[PDB]
Amino acid sequence: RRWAVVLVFSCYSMCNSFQWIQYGSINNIFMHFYGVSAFAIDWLSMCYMLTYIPLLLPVAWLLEKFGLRTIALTGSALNCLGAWVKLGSLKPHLFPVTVVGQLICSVAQVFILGMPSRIASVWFGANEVSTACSVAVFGNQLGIAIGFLVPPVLVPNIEDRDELAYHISIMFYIIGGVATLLLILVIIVFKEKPKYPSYLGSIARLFKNLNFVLLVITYGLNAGAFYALSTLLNRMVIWHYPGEEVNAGRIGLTIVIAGMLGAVISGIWLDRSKTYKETTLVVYIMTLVGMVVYTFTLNLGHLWVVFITAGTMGFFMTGYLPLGFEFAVELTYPESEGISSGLLNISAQVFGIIFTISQGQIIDNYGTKPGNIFLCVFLTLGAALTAFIKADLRRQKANKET
Numbered sequence: 436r437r438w439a440v441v442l443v444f445s446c447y448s449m450c451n452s453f454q455w456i457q458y459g460s461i462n463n464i465f466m467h468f469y470g471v472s473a474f475a476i477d478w479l480s481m482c483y484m485l486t487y488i489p490l491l492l493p494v495a496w497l498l499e500k501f502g503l504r505t506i507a508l509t510g511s512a513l514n515c516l517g518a519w520v521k522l523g524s525l526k527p528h529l530f531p532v533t534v535v536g537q538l539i540c541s542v543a544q545v546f547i548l549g550m551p552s553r554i555a556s557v558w559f560g561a562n563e564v565s566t567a568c569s570v571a572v573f574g575n576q577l578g579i580a581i582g583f584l585v586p587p588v589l590v591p592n593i594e595d596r597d598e599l600a601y602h603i604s605i606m607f608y609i610i611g612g613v614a615t616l617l618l619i620l621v622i623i624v625f626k627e628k629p630k631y632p633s634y635l636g637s638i639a640r641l642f643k644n645l646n647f648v649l650l651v652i653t654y655g656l657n658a659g660a661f662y663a664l665s666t667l668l669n670r671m672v673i674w675h676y677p678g679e680e681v682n683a684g685r686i687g688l689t690i691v692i693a694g695m696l697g698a699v700i701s702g703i704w705l706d707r708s709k710t711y712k713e714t715t716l717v718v719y720i721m722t723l724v725g726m727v728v729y730t731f732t733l734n735l736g737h738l739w740v741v742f743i744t745a746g747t748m749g750f751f752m753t754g755y756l757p758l759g760f761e762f763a764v765e766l767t768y769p770e771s772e773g774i775s776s777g778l779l780n781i782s783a784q785v786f787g788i789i790f791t792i793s794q795g796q797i798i799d800n801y802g803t804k805p806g807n808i809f810l811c812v813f814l815t816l817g818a819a820l821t822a823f824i825k826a827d828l829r830r831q832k833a834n835k836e837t
C-alpha cells in the first residue's frame with residue numbers, strides 16, 4: 436500500500452499544480468474571455484505564492500497535531516472544492532469566482548509541498564525515503580508540464596465568448612473530475628499510520644548560519660525566476676509568435692521535462708559523488724548561460740531556436756531545485772530538514788512574487804527584452820552569491836563519524 440499512497444499524493448499534487456499554471460498557460464485567452472488585463476490574470480498565479488507564506492506555519496501545526504491522514508484528506512478536499520468552485524465563473528463577468536477558486540486551490544497547495552518528506556519518513560525506510568520524495572516532486576513538476584500543455588489544446592483562441600466559455604467549461608470539468616476521483620482515492624487509500632515508537636529556536640540557529648542564508652537567497656532567486664518565467668511564458672512567447680498558443684504550451688512542457696531530466700542527472704551525480712558547492716555553482720552558471728541564450732534568441736522568428744534553448748536552459752534551471760534542498764540539508768544537518776525545506780520554499784515564493792510582478796510591469800511598459808534582461812541580471816547576481824558560498828558540509832562530516 437505504501438506506494439499507492441505515494442502514487443495518489445503525486446497525482447493530486449499534479450492536479451493542484453495544473454490548477455496553478457492553467458491560467459498562465461493560456462493567459463491571453465483568459466484575458467480576452469474575462470476582459471481583464473494581463474496583470475489580473477497574472478495574479479491567479481501569484482495567489483499560490485502569496486498564500487504559501489502565511490499559511491505554512493499553521494499547516495505544520497495542523498500536521499503535528501492531527502497526523503498525515505487528515506492533512507492529506509484536507510488538501511485533496513480543498514483542491515476539489517477549489518476546482519469545482521471555478522465552474523461558477525463560466526461567464527465574462529465572474530472573474531471574482533475564479534480568483535476565489537484559485538485562492539481555495541492555493542490554500543490546498545500549502546498542504547502539499549511539505550507533505551512528501553513526512554510521507555517518505557512514515558511510509559518508507561532509509562532504503563526508500565529518497566525515492567518517495569523524488570517521485571512526489573516529479574509528480575508536481577509533471578503537473579506543471581501538463582498544465583502548460585493541455586489548456587492551449589482544449590481552449591482555442593476564438594473571438595466568440597460563448598464558444599470560449601464552452602471550451603473553458605470542458606477544461607474545468609476534466610480537472611474537476613480528476614480532483615473528485617483523487618479525493619475519493621485519498622479517502623480510500625490514505626489510511627492513517629503512526630510510526631513504530633523549538634521552531635523559533637531552530638530558525639534562529641539556522642539564520643545564525645550565514646551559509647544557509649546565502650543558499651536561501653540564491654534558491655529564492657532561481658525558483659522565483661522559474662516561477663516568473665513559467666507565469667509569463669505565454670505573454671512573451673505569443674508577443675513574438677502570434678497565434679502559437681499550443682506551441683507555447685509545448686515549450687513549457689519541454690522546459691519542465693528537461694527540468695525533470697536534469698534533476699535526475701543532478702541527483703545521480705550527488706549520490707555518486709559528494710561535491711555540492713561545485714555542482715551548485717556549475718548548475719547556476721549554466722542556468723544563467725541558458726537564460727541569456729533564451730533571451731537573446733527568443734526574438735528571431737523561428738521556434739527552431741526557441742524549443743532547444745528553452746529546454747537546455749530549463750534543464751539546469753529546474754535541476755537546481757532538488758539540489759538546493761539537498762545542499763541545505765548538507766549545510767544544516769543537525770536541524771530538521773523540514774524547516775530548511777520550508778524556508779527555501781518561502782524564499783522561492785517571495786522572490787517569485789517579486790520577479791513576476793516586476794517582469795510583468797517591465798513587459799507591459801518596456802517590452803519582453805527588458806524584462807528578460809532584468810531576470811538575467813538577477814540570476815547572475817544569484818550565481819555570484821552562490822559562488823561566494825563556503826561549503827561547511829555538516830552532514831558529510833557528521834556521517835563520517837564511523
Ligand SMILES: C[N+](C)(C)CCO
Pocket residue numbers: 452455483484487544575662784
Ligand atoms: C509552482 N508550485 C506549485 C510548485 C509552487 C508555487 O507556490
